[PDB]
Amino acid sequence: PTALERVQKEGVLRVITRNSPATYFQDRNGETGFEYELAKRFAERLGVELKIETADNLDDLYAQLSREGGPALAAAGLTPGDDASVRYSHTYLDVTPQIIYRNGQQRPTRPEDLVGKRIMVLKGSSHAEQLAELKKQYPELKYEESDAVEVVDLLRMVDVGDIDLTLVDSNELAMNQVYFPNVRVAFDFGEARGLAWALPGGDDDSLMNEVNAFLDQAKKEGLLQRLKDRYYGHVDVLGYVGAYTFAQHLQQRLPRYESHFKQSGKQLDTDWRLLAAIGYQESLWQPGATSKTGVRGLMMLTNRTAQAMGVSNRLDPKQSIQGGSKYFVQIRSELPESIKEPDRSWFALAAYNIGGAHLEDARKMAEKEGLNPNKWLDVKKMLPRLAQKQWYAKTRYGYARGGETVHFVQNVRRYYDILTWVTQ
Ligand SMILES: CC[C@H](C)[C@H](N)C(=O)O
Question: What distance, in Å, lies between the first and last C-alpha atoms of the chain?
């Protein structure tokens, strides 16, 4: 039976990956990861179940792949390795290895500067191999390979000054930037290269052909780009300053209010990280925060909402978290029965910012356009229109800043993702 026929026969596609939020992550809310979502799509294309294995490290990852009866493929942000014990699919993401340093230290600008530093990379990585190449040229270059850490750990070490430098791909630095406020790109070390899935060595090309056809379909429909934005887009969407500032706020601000968020979350069957995400978007986790628009405190409440909720002080963190949390749940509960989770929460987020009246208008508008008013992706196309006259003059409630409401829901969902992917 071909590699491809065997997968169909078993009704399972076995995938091996790295223990990493970038690749595969287990949370109470389900499974996420750039590679997980991409592979899950592959399995479903083939009409089979996805079964995920995580390796201990990169050497063990490649060793399992060549192992008889092992996984069909590795999906793990791999950079192509002549070792015909392993083969590689077409590439699916353009990334750049980048030398990483700690802000407030001498920035190395060229490979020469890598000499005489404390450097660590993952044992078995293409990054390790790059440094072996440079060592050939510069015989006194020192660095260490480790099989007992992952990429998140290498960046922590640079962040707190445990080591001077590391070397990682630019996608994963972007992803991690929101955890490590001091980490910065020293320079791009080596040129841009594509990530590839790896398959066992040999001449059976039945599954490889399907992987390539699938990845090429993925680039046709923007799937790879959507997945990139979600996991790797943090610095691009929130801006550089937003990225490292969040890392700082996560470190400095959140631990003061984490326990209130959890307590509000438990008593309301609502994920506390979703509540924390709203607090970040509203006030950047600052209890004293006031606007000059009639909203104040950590969850940014109006006086009216504060009183309805039993809040006697909006600048009290605990009370602001409780009232804004109850309020979000209230809004979400009042939504029409027809809106199912997960959309229901994203609708509730929009209503938190714009109110149910304008949100109704966006729902009515989607309906007028032959879209589905209970689907978030549909209504989200309608929200920016509330700010345009050809549209809002035809609405009950008129002009609203719906583009801002879109921004609100995206950011919160991103902050939510970020808080979910935290490791310790
Ligand atoms: C952590 C190193 C990563 C996985 C790199 N792209 C490699 O293939 O080795």
Answer: 44
Experimental method: X-ray
Which amino acid type is present at position 82? D
Please choose, from the candidates 291, 409, 414, the residue with its C-alpha nearest in 3D space to the C-alpha of residue 301.
291
Q: How far is the CA of 127 from the centre of ligand 1 (A)?
A: 7
- Closest Cα to atom 2, ligand 1: which residue? 125
CB atoms within 10 A of CB 384: 17
Task: Determine which residue's CA is closest to atom 4 belonging to ligand 1.
Answer: 78
Pick the catalytic residue from 129, 140, 282, 404: 282
Q: CA separation (Å) from 39 to 6, 248, 338?
A: 17, 33, 31
Q: What would the DSSP string read from start to end of 372-422?
A: -TT-HHHHHHHGGGGGSHHHHTTSSS----HHHHHHHHHHHHHHHHHHHT-
Q: Do you know the residue count of the chain?
A: 424
254: DSSP letter? G
Atom from ligand 1 closest to the CA of residue 150: 1
Domain extents in the chain? 1-95+192-232, 96-191, 233-424
Distance (Å, whole) CA 303 – CA 289? 14
- Class of the domain covering 96-191: alpha beta
3-state secondary structure of 9: helix
Q: Name the DSSP letter for residue 339.
A: -
Cβ–ligand 1 contact at 126 (below 6 Å):
yes
Reference 419, options 274, 242, 227, 245; nearest CA is 274
Our answer to whether residue 221 is catalytic in this structure is no
Amino acid at 203: D
Domains 1-95+192-232 and 96-191 share a fold: yes
Q: Which atom of ligand 1 is nearest to the CA of 18?
A: 4
Phi, psi of 169, deg, nearest 5: -75, 145
**CATH architecture classification, 1-95+192-232:** 3-Layer(aba) Sandwich (3.40)
Question: What count of other Cβ atoms lies within 10 Å of the Cβ of residue 249?
Answer: 16
- The CA 122 to ligand 1 mean position distance, Å, reads 8
Centroid of ligand 1 to alpha carbon of 161 (angstroms): 23
- Report how far Cα 218 is from the mean position of its chain's Cα atoms: 19
**Closest ligand 1 atom number to CA of residue 122:** 1
Residues 6+ apart with CB under 8 A from 243: 174, 177, 178, 234, 235
Q: Which tokens belong to 290?
A: 């006031």
Helices (H), 138-257: 151-160, 170-176, 206-221, 223-232, 234-252
